[PDB]
Symmetry: C2
Subunit: 592 residues, 2 copies
């Protein structure tokens, strides 16, 4: 039970530079009082001083809310611009978002910049909302005692934690529900269809298309249901953006904050050497592991040891990749991005490329380098001094079951005093990052899309993992993280593109595997061509079918629209009246 | 010099059924007088009676215009809803469009239904606007004395003949200008690069992508420049639509006009037997022609006779296809379409399929059936009783130069008395159909995209033909057709899709030809794969590049937007003021 505290600011103050901090402390408090926020300073753990921030008067917040609504209508995410009409009430998500905007936005936008990165607030560590322990307990208990989740649970998640967390949980729920179809015909193929079935690959591609398009429709439906349809158009300035000078684009009077694009491109070009070095190092590691496993297969008991290195490889996956992820972040911090959307998209692209490598390159080597060309691992036995087509199937099994275990291990198993202690322990937790969960789900989807044909049972394992994850991530948000700042998005974002890629490549990969493990380059090229064009045709057909489904968003929009809803002139003086024209026409008929 | 006549209605009246017509004649005149239109009945040629219609009072037309503007703003094609602000004036195109709406729209929409097809007006033949002979003379003289046309000419065409004709002429101008690049490197390949150059095919695919994407951007720019951005969303009811009953969709109170979709699908399924019969008959005709030409090559003088049948084939193209076109129209009249957009799209799709067959199947047979499999025309010499890889090149030459000649032959070389005579001769002319010109240009673009690699000089011939056509179609509209009703479109329509198809297929066709005429299925499949994926990658790259060009529409839109622009409460009673919080914070700093 919180004490009405809306936000908490850390404001670490070390004794080495206390003086510069001390005056800065007052520079904080006044900077809040001018915005109409009541402040509450209290003791902090490890030479810190947490300050609690709440709304001073409800009238100021109502007006702020009204102002926000007006802007949202201006940018087009609202239907009609509405101050005593609150009886659309203010949910906790949007109230917290507006409080964060008041605390964060500069004086130009009616706020007061307390950004903990760019400005003089170098002693402010984190500004975070507090957790509702009763709500978290009820949420966990309700989700852990139900086999399925209706839209009511996702709506509650939206109301409490914002639209980003709600969109992630909706995507996870839809993906888990759609994983039932694939799981069914994967078990069917495993039971009856022998090994490396081509029709299973076709069904997997069809399911990938169907799920991707249906989710693209469902996210639009959800965005319309909430009030966040079109937020992607609203560009948000990044506080960390460093400028060179301020210009004035001759379209508006706004003094834009310019940065030479060529300077940014000169840094973005540093991604190519980084990606090449990462791919070379990981390729060397995977080649070494494959050579060692081939040597341990050739030279002798059980068959579990044959892929023992591969297991270890994935055990090293969350470390190695993690390190790489950090580098990616630094790279994304080196190229300046003036928009939150652009920065997020670039970071997501870099992380997706790195995780794609670290998660799929071993399978790619096993399927398209070792099996077709089984004469390059000669050097393999030569160095280790002291062709099985089921290799890809066993590698897929070990890349399905064991990474699930390692991710579960990483994520799950690893009169005022009580409230103050709770806040103090909350500040040490890490801020929730939904991009990591999105990346994990996208990686699993890619596994299903382009490698489940080797082991069709992978879909069932991923379905069980997704059911467990729908509650594991809820528990992680509830007790293992600070409450995320409630943001607003109309979609899962650039991850959508990733999904499409992982679908398309799947159509080329799966069928190729089917040709390369069931037994001439002509046949392989023909199979790849047929699979890719079948994928494209199915994509067109599914898009056409879903374009004629009459989604609630469209009828809601058209309902709103409906509710809103001399000789040159003597030519006409000859017969000016009414009856004379008819009479003359009748005479003209009689004559001819 | 017209006499201020806005529209002319034919109203044919035969002596066999004059009585039923005679009363119906009055049923016309009153039906116009209620809308506020001055009428003028005069003699007609061949037992007809033309009636001229003009605006009765300028106030009624101004109000009608105002009403139209309000609707356009409601559907979202206008920036802001504006009656004395006419000083955006009324151009001739929109004035004529509103007069046609008054004459055509039923009483529900403020008009009076004088549709010459569905209602009792079975004697009304055509309602057409009159031609401005002075404007036509000036237009032809200006266009025939200039090497290039600026946007001023296209704007004048928009102002006079509406947005459909203007969009066609803009597309033709852009296509002719973009045909310069291809023409240049086609002459380069023809001069130096031997025969069947692969890099020429890659350049042709790149140009197809570039032109298609740049035109997709340019049409959006033109739609924003005019007031027709988003008209595609405005669905227009088709007067010819036959109903079964009227329902009420539970989203609006409008009594929708229902028609069972399954009944329409049962008729749309008749397209498959029709298409199969057409393709079989045309395939038999082309196989017979190819066999006869092969026999006349084998048995003996000149080399012009070898492709003499092929020439004749294209001479039979505008007849045979024409007949098929008529059937297509009847088919499109058999499946009921409740929207003008849907009816137009279906008719365009049927016509495109038929013309695709009749224009490309001979080349497809010569390139992918005769050359690869040169042992199926055995029966060829056997029946005619009484492998050259340059066959495709010569066939492409004869399908370039000669169809241009046949289309030119088909299109070009084949105090009140004077005004009345001019109108009488105008009623006998055929209404201008821009879909035919769009189809011809799309067919030529397909020729360039997927068959110009056989004869690279085809681009220069098509460029000369396009320059001549920019004036030939203008002359056809000026003197060989009635003035089209000024419609409103935001794009060239479904033809866009056709272009994309004719681009994609080109990437598969061109390169295939390069492999099949320069010399193993593996090589052919590899070349097709590389060409198609190069096309897709180039498409993505060009889309990304053009998404960051800052088109005038976007800045105009964002400029318009900018211009529009107890213990639970004692926690805060401990330090309520301003100075006390700072003092206590300083003390807390001093203590720790
Ligand atoms: C080795 C495998 C590499 C796969 C390449 C990544 C393809 C998926 C890219 C995943 C991603 O989120 O990036 C999107 C665009 O991608 C890109 O700009 C592609 C950049 C080049 C990819 C390298 C975002 O853009 P958006 O439109 O969502 O905003
Ligand atoms: C390598 C670039 C990969 C770009 C990844 C971006 C992407 O989403 O590509 C999708 C599939 O790719 C493709 O169809 C073509 C990828 C060709 C790459 C082969 C080399 C198309 O997604 P859509 O356009 O629907 O958005
Ligand atoms: C033998 C060659 C056949 C080529 C197939 C035609 C492909 C181009 C189709 C040309 C066309 O205008 O049709 C579009 C959709 O096409 C279609 O519905 C495809 C229908 C099946 C094609 C048969 C219109 O739709 P839209 O989105 O513009 O409204
Ligand atoms: C046969 C169906 C042809 C559908 C024609 C409709 C079409 O425009 O297809 C274009 C190319 O086709 C394709 O990429 C795939 C066509 C595969 C057909 C091969 C069989 C894609 O155009 P987009 O999606 O950009 O709109
Ligand atoms: Ca997990
Ligand atoms: Ca997770
Ligand atoms: Ca012509
Ligand atoms: Ca023409």
């Amino acid at each position: 039970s919180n004490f009405g505290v809306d936000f908490v600011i850390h404001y670490k103050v070390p004794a080495a530079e206390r003086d510069e901090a001390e005056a800065g402390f007052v520079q904080l408090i006044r900077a809040l009082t001018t915005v109409g926020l009541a402040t509450e300073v209290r003791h902090g753990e490890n030479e810190s001083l947490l300050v609690f921030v709440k709304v001073a008067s409800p009238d100021l917040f109502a007006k702020q809310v009204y102002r926000a609504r007006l802007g949202d209508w201006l940018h087009g995410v609202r239907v009609s611009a509405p101050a005593q009409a609150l009886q659309e009430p203010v949910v906790e998500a949007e109230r917290l978002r507006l409080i964060y905007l008041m605390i964060t936005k500069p004086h130009n936008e009616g706020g007061a910049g307390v950004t903990p990165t760019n400005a003089k607030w170098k002693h402010v560590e984190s500004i975070f909302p507090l957790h509702s322990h009763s709500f978290n307990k009820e949420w966990i208990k309700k989700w852990s005692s139900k086999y399925t989740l209706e839209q009511t649970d996702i709506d509650n998640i939206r109301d409490k934690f914002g639209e980003s967390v709600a969109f992630y949980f909706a995507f996870l729920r839809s993906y888990f529900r759609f994983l039932v179809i694939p799981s069914a015909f994967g078990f069917g193929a495993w039971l009856l269809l022998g090994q490396f079935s081509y029709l299973y690959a076709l069904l997997c591609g069809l399911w990938s298309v169907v799920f991707f398009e249906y989710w693209k429709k469902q996210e639009v439906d959800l965005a319309v249901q909430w009030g966040v349809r079109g937020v992607s158009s609203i560009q948000q300035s990044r506080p960390e953006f460093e400028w060179e000078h301020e210009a004035e684009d001759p379209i508006t009077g706004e003094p834009v904050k310019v940065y030479p694009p060529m300077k940014r491109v000169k840094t973005q070009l540093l991604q190519i050497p980084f990606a090449l070095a990462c791919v070379v190092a990981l390729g060397a590691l995977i080649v070494t592991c494959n050579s060692l496993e081939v040597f341990i297969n050739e030279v002798y008991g059980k068959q579990y040891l044959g892929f023992l290195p591969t297991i270890f490889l994935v055990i090293g996956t969350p470390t190695i990749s993690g390190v790489l992820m950090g580098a990616a972040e630094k790279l994304n911090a080196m190229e300046n991005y003036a928009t939150v959307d652009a920065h997020d998209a670039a970071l997501i692209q870099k992380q997706f490329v790195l995780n794609f490598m670290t998660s799929y390159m071993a399978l790619f080597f096993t399927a398209f380098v070792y099996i077709p060309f089984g004469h390059i691992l000669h050097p393999f036995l030569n160095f280790w001094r002291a062709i099985n087509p089921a290799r890809i199937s066993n590698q897929m099994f070990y890349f399905t079951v064991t990474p699930q275990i390692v991710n579960f291990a990483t994520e799950v198993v690893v009169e005022e005093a009580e409230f103050l202690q709770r806040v103090r322990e909350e500040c040490t937790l890490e801020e929730y990052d939904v991009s990591g969960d999105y990346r994990e789900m996208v990686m699993q989807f890619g596994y299903v899309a382009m490698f489940s044909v080797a082991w069709p049972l992978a879909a069932c394992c991923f379905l069980v993992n997704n059911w467990v994850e729908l509650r594991s991530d809820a528990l992680k948000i509830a007790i293992s993280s600070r409450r995320p700042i409630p943001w607003r998005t109309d979609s899962i974002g650039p991850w959508l593109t990733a999904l499409s890629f992982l679908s398309w490549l799947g159509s080329i990969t799966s069928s190729a595997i089917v040709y390369l493990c069931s037994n001439k380059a002509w046949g392989l090229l023909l199979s790849i061509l047929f699979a890719e064009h079948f994928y494209l045709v199915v994509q067109l057909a599914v898009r056409f079918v879903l374009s004629k489904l009459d989604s609630p968003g469209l009828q809601k929009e058209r309902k709103e629209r409906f509710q809103t809803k001399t000789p040159e002139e003597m030519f006409w003086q000859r017969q000016r009246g009414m009856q004379e024209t008819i009479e003359i026409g009748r005479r003209m008929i009689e004559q001819q």
